[PDB]
Predict the 3D structure of the following.
Amino acid sequence: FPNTISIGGLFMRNTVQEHSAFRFAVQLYNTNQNTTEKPFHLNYHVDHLDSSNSFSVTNAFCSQFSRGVYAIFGFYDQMSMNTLTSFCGALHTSFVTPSFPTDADVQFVIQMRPALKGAILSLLSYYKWEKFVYLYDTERGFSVLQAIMEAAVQNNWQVTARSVGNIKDVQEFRRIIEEMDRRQEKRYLIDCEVERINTILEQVVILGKHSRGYHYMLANLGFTDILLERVMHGGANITGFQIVNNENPMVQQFIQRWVRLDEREFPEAKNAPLKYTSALTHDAILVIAEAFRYLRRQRVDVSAGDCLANPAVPWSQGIDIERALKMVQVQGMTGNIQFDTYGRRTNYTIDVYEMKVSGSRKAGYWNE
Amino acid sequence: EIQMTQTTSSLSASLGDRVTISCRASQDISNYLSWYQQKPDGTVKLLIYYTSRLHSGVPSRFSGSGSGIDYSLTINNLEQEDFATYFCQQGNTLPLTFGAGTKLELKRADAAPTVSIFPPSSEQLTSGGASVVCFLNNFYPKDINVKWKIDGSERQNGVLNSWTDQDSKDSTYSMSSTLTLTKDEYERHNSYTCEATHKTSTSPIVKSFNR
Amino acid sequence: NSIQIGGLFPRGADQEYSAFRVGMVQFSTSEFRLTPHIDNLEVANSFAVTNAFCSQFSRGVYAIFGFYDKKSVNTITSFCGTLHVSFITPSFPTDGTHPFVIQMRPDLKGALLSLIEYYQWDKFAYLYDSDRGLSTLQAVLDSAAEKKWQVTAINVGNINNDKKDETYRSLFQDLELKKERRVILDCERDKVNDIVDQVITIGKHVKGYHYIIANLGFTDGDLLKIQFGGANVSGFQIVDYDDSLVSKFIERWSTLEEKEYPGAHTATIKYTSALTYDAVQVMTEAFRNLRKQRIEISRRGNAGDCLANPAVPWGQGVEIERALKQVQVEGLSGNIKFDQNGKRINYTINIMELKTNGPRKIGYWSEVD
Amino acid sequence: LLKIQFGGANVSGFQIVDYDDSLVSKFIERWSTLEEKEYPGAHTATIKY
Amino acid sequence: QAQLKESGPGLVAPSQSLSITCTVSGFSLTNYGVHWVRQPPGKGLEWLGVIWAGGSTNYNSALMSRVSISKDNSKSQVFLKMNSLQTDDTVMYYCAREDYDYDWHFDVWGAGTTVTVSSAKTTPPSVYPLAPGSAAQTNSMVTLGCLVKGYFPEPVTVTWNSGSLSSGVHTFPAVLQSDLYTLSSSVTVPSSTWPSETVTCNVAHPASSTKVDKK
Amino acid sequence: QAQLKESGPGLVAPSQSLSITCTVSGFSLTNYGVHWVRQPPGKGLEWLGVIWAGGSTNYNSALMSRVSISKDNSKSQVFLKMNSLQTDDTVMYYCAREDYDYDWHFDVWGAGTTVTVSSAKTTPPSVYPLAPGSAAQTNSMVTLGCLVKGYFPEPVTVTWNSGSLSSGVHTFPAVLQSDLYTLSSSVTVPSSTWPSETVTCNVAHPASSTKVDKK
Ligand SMILES: *[C@@H]1O[C@H](CO)[C@@H](O[C@@H]2O[C@H](CO)[C@@H](O[C@@H]3O[C@H](CO)[C@@H](O)[C@H](O)[C@@H]3O)[C@H](O)[C@H]2NC(C)=O)[C@H](O)[C@H]1NC(C)=O
Ligand SMILES: *[C@@H]1O[C@H](CO)[C@@H](O[C@@H]2O[C@H](CO)[C@@H](O[C@@H]3O[C@H](CO)[C@@H](O)[C@H](O)[C@@H]3O)[C@H](O)[C@H]2NC(C)=O)[C@H](O)[C@H]1NC(C)=O
Ligand SMILES: *[C@@H]1O[C@H](CO)[C@@H](O)[C@H](O)[C@H]1NC(C)=O
Ligand SMILES: *[C@@H]1O[C@H](CO)[C@@H](O)[C@H](O)[C@H]1NC(C)=O
């Protein structure tokens, strides 16, 4: 029984802190000095993707497949979502990823980031909105947009949506905010990236007179990375989402072991806050470790060729490995970790933080 | 241009055999070749398209395969209507040079050639000529040689050879040799002999006639 | 000269392959000859698409014709963008300006928004399918927010074929909450017929409603069943059957054998088949322009592996895309003229309205007017 | 009647074969199992009057 | 079904014209192509040319200034003209239809005709009898023969008793010597039929239209 | 398809019962009728009786108080009981299905069984060899034989080399004499196989279950 576990690494641009947390989680697993929780040795190989096109993604995937791995940690965007899901469902290769959850239901894809639309619709039913604005991009799926449209149908709402993914000029943001002022719109929902949310909030602050009497619900898990300091000094609603609790003792142990690292071997570790993607990376390392320990306790075999063989003829132990990655019930940095039969996150908890003029507070927790 | 070739000029088989016919090309044709059949009357039909597919109207007994420059056709069981000329046709680059074309043959027992010598008639001899005929019928296979002898001397000039097709009743063959000379050359010789050398006998069957 | 090309077709595209055969027989030339290597593989599974791409690239082709799903567009824009191989397609227009992507379907969002602004709507429903992207949904939501409209936009694509009777019943029961009268159907040629059949079953095609068949094939569906209902129902057409060349192609099309050519014994023809028949003419005209410009690009089947590291391109293909942008012809979709990106300029879409005697054209639409 | 069932127009009619009886349901259970080639018009859930 | 039939003059002088007419049926000639191909006896087949449905026509590279092709869609006919013929033009000609089934293939072909280019004059054939000589009944079937010598041009129709007696007919092929055709035909009649029944071979030469009956 | 198979005891004593079981398949016994018919060897077939799907049953006029029929729809079986049997009950029995196709006809029948009513005791058979005597090879095939005398009851299975030697097997029928079965079997083997290869006839009597091999 190997005694040789090499995993694949598919890292895109802006994945520096995620790569550092990946390497540090591998280092924490290799330095356990305990034969029970560490019964083998864990290796890896990293390919840094320069472009987001499917050509380089396919080249790096076939490099990892010709090298010979058992699981692949990776990232994807809209340009490389279905390429990775098709190449990992065809060759029966397990693919653990902390990126955005996909729309359809596929196999051999273990998604670490939980879904967001359930807590969004629960907070819409709680706050009782019937007429609001919905800013969105395309870079994190279309399930949230279809869920908002379906809830506007079933509950008779008035959603004024803008696709702001291709907009680069801030004058368009200014005229959209002025048009929503002319429509007397007071309630907002922004499902966008971190830089785009920061840009929209900077345009709100620089344009000004948009703090008192307004409500902004930011549908993103990067609530710690949102530059919302200037908005809080105007007297505005701030509603966000987090999955990383600082009262979780494993999280603060990871903080106390994380801030002592060097910049040379682990960049972006001290000069930046701990993102949610790094916590999902550490939890993915924990899930892979628990799955291979479960495969060793059940004595199931895990053990070459080309990625473009006609036919492929995959090795059938990957179905058993996908079974071993969809029955993991553990407690990581994002709380409880389970999976469904499609690799989506289940039995999880989203922390919701409201920031009023009195300050910041934890308003409650969402349960599915 | 691209030249196609087929080394096998004739194949012999019986009813119910899997016969294979190969074809080679001067360069890679990317499997863009077809296999067609042509009966002896002149009717030409198509058998296999794109080197692997069967055309609508052809039976499922035949098949085709191959790769690169080497293509092949295969027949699972030979029938009575399957006796025809199989030809390969490339269609990659203009001009579309076709193959050589092989002819299937029915296998039977090697029978001895029945030889019959016929001298010239009086009406032909009155015109100034004399054509001694030699008919060798009911033989197997088609490999046979003929020789004419005029009073012991072998003659090669003025020899006409006509080979007939395989009969569909007895699976045999016929051949006709003709030695045509003048009346003065026929009057200067008395005994003329025709010798037939076949695969069934090492000694040639000789039929001689005198005056 | 022999020009080897690749052609990809999904399992189930029978009429489009028949139109491809008719276009290859009809548009044969004298100076050269095309050779399509045909791959009948799946279009949704990107692994089989990548296998067919690398198998065609191992044969060393100069151009690749074929379809693509919305689930695998980012593959085709990648592998044809890096290796500099032109890809001609009759599928939906992509979202962006991708190189080496020559496309046959014109924009439908502009004509649809022009039809709404002609009809002057303010509150309508939009039943869309999630299999050709979400570009039209984003366009109608942006123009609805810019023009103060009320769009009840509902996805329908996630409904299986096993229980597609109670779902549609609950759908049109929920569409009677706000008393919706006007519905735009953005579905393909297969889902539109099922939706019309279920509307006819539940009885919502009387005078008082409205429907828009949001595709180019308005005459493709069975319109003999909501003709005598006669609400208003309208749509868009790209194949004008009143032209001389189109009527000649129909008169040469309906006489074909069904066993020799499947999906050809119809009075009409699907719009993707007409776009395939036009794309064959476009490729033939571009290869004839290269045969007339005295440019020798002849090679063999040694293009190498598709996963070469680094995969170095060959520059003579860069003119070939510049060939395809230099083609201005006349086919079944009217005028065919392209831009620097690969989209279509100077096209014409007819606006059909279904009357009692049949569909009647009320006008045309272009991008310059 | 699967085509004017969801129309909304209330449709009345007369029935002589009550399918809720015991003998009628037994005859239907012995009827729908018959071969179509051996008995034409018998592979239906119902039967003509 | 679709069929094709080729017809020609058969015998023409050297350095002259040669018109071949191919009639097609079962299909249309407005949407398909027609390819004409020659075939030398004992040699490889050569593609003469092809004509497309869109008015395009291509020919061979070695004899591009020697062949021409036209068509009439009303009668569904194809006319192939060939000038500057030589002595090696005694070949066969075939017409076929083209199709696209992932490759440019030939789907429906024709029967083809024979063209013999020679400057020799047409002469009637001479029929001579050929019997076994000895009247010894070696078997129940006796074989007789007819030798047709001095015919021009090929071929002639050699029948036995106007197509009635056709049991055991061994028609040998013809040969050419000094521009003269030499052929032999054989018939297998019964031992009691000969010479009790008249077995007459009829040779019809269509070049000179000479009908000669020889008992 | 629908099939029917009849089974019985084969040998029963006189003035006793006789139960025959008919199994039907491919159809149902709740909507069709089942008719049982006897067949004497060398005489005319006589209809024993019939039962309907609705519980109705009819019998023959001469033996109405001698036969009875019942059925089980769960196993799809038909049980026919026959009492007061005589020495002339050595007959065959067949079960068939009835149908209406403008006439009351028999559509699907069965294989049928043989019933021999005799009070004789079961005895094992005696196998004796039968060679040609003279060793003169008259042909390439030589015939050997086995005579099975004194068997009770009919029939027995006579095979040649456990079913391997089945070329030229001439199995003659048996006869009855003094309540004893007399049968002959013949095998045609090659002239070089005998006596170089052991040709042994195996007689299995299922009445006494006696397996006798004779070389
Ligand atoms: C190294 O890691 C192992 C983790 O397993 C620690 O050993 C002991 O592991 C067992 C489970 O494997 C822990 O649970 C115990 O299980 C037994 C048997 O099922 C049960 O009878 C006990 O009641 C208990 O539930 C056990 O707690 C754990 N031992 C301790 C002290 O926590 C081990 O401690 C680690 N460290 C080393 C070896 O330094
Ligand atoms: C087309 O579908 C729509 C949706 O069901 C309907 O449109 C209505 O058509 C009527 C004609 O029956 C039109 O009424 C007209 O209004 C103009 C206003 O300027 C007036 O000048 C005319 O005299 C006439 O009354 C109108 O275009 C439109 N809307 C309303 C509110 O009536 C109808 O079902 C279909 N209409 C046609 C013309 O096919
Ligand atoms: C979720 O996890 C908790 C904690 O282990 C457990 O008690 C509960 O049963 C789980 N629920 C489901 C549906 O798995
Ligand atoms: C558009 O196309 C039409 C028809 O081909 C042509 O007459 C017209 O000049 C074109 N206009 C432009 C601007 O290309």
Summary: The CA atoms of residues 209 and 247 of chain C lie 33 Å apart. The interface with chain D takes residues 169, 201-203 of chain C (CB under 8 Å). Residues C 335, 346 surround 2-acetamido-2-deoxy-beta-D-glucopyranose (ligand 4) (CB under 6 Å).
